[PDB]
C-alpha cells in the first residue's frame, strides 16, 4: 500500500520511531535484533520481487559477484568438500574472499 | 604455575600464560553451565511429553548444522 | 623442566583449547535455547490440553445435572 | 596518624579492582561468543 501511494518515506519514518521507542530500554547494539517489525520491514523493501527496481538488482549483482565467485574459487582450488563447508567455521576457510 | 616462567623468560610471557589459562577455565565453566542446562531441559521435555502421550507443535528432528571442531592431535 | 620448544607446545595447546571452547559454547548456546523452546512449547500445548480436558469433563457434569 | 592508617588499608580495597577489570575482559568474550551465535 505504501508503494501505491508512494508514502514509503512516511511509513519508514514512523516504523523506525515506533520500533526504536519500544526497544529503547534494551541496549543499543541489539536495536535491530530485539525488535520485531524493523528487520522484516527493510528486508521486504530492499530484498523482494515486488519492491526492488531492477536497476538496483544489477547494482547488488556487481558488488557481490566478484566476492561470491572468489568464494567459489577457493572451494575448487583447495578441493573443499560439501560437508567440510558446513562443519567448519566459515571464517577459517573463506578469509581471502572476505 | 606463573612464577617459574615469570622468572627467566620474562614478566610479559607470564601475563600471556595468565588470562589464557584463566580464560580456559572461564569458558569451560560457562560451557558446563550450558551442558547442565541441556540435561535439565531434556529431562523436563521427556517427562512432560510422556504426559501428552498418556500433531505436536514442535519440530522434533535434526538441526541445521553448525561448526563442530576437534583438538589438533590431542584426543 | 619446561624450556624452549615445550613453552611453544604449551601455548599452542592452550590456544587450541580456547578456540575449541569458543565453538562448543557457540553450539551449546544454540542447543540450550533449542531445548528450552521445545520444553516451553510442549508446556503451552499440555496446558491447553488440560484446560480443554477438565472443561469437557465438567461440561459432562452440567449435562447430567 | 588518621590519614596514614586509614589510607593504607583502602589499597587493600583497591587490590580487587584489577579483579573486576579482569572479569570485565572475560564478559567481553562471553558477549562476543553469544553475538557469534546470534548472527
Amino acid at each position: 500500500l505504501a508503494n501505491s501511494f508512494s508514502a514509503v518515506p512516511d511509513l519508514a519514518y514512523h516504523l523506525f520511531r515506533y520500533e526504536l521507542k519500544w526497544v529503547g530500554h534494551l541496549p543499543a547494539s541489539l536495536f535491530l535484533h530485539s525488535s520485531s517489525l524493523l528487520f522484516p520491514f527493510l528486508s521486504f523493501v530492499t530484498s523482494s520481487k515486488e519492491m526492488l527496481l531492477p536497476g538496483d538488482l544489477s547494482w547488488l549483482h556487481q558488488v557481490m559477484d566478484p566476492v561470491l565467485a572468489a568464494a567459489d574459487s577457493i572451494v575448487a582450488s583447495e578441493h573443499l568438500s560439501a560437508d567440510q563447508i558446513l562443519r567448519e567455521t566459515p571464517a577459517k576457510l573463506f578469509r581471502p574472499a572476505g | 604455575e606463573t612464577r617459574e616462567l615469570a622468572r627467566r623468560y620474562g614478566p610479559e610471557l607470564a601475563h600471556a600464560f595468565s588470562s589464557l589459562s584463566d580464560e580456559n577455565k572461564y569458558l569451560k565453566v560457562k560451557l558446563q553451565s550450558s551442558q547442565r542446562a541441556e540435561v535439565r531441559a531434556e529431562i523436563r521435555a521427556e517427562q512432560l511429553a510422556n504426559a501428552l502421550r498418556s500433531d505436536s507443535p514442535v519440530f522434533r528432528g535434526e538441526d541445521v548444522p553448525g561448526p563442530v571442531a576437534v583438538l589438533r592431535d590431542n584426543k | 623442566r619446561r624450556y624452549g620448544p615445550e613453552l611453544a607446545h604449551a601455548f599452542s595447546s592452550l590456544s587450541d583449547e580456547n578456540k575449541y571452547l569458543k565453538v562448543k559454547l557457540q553450539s551449546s548456546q544454540r542447543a540450550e535455547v533449542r531445548a528450552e523452546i521445545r520444553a516451553e512449547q510442549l508446556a503451552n500445548a499440555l496446558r491447553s490440553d488440560e484446560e480443554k480436558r477438565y472443561a469437557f469433563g465438567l461440561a459432562r457434569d452440567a449435562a447430567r445435572g | 596518624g588518621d590519614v596514614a592508617a586509614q589510607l593504607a588499608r583502602v589499597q587493600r580495597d583497591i587490590d580487587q579492582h584489577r579483579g573486576t577489570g579482569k572479569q570485565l575482559g572475560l564478559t567481553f568474550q562471553e558477549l562476543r561468543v553469544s553475538r557469534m551465535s546470534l548472527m
Binding site: 571464517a91 | 589464557l20 | 578456540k19 | 575482559g25
Partner: peptide, 14 residues
C-alpha cells in the same frame, strides 16, 4: 579491548 587471541579475531575485528 577484548584480547584478540586467535587468527580469526584479527580478521573479523580489524
Amino acid at each position: 579491548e577484548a584480547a584478540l587471541r586467535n587468527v580469526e579475531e584479527q580478521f573479523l575485528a580489524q
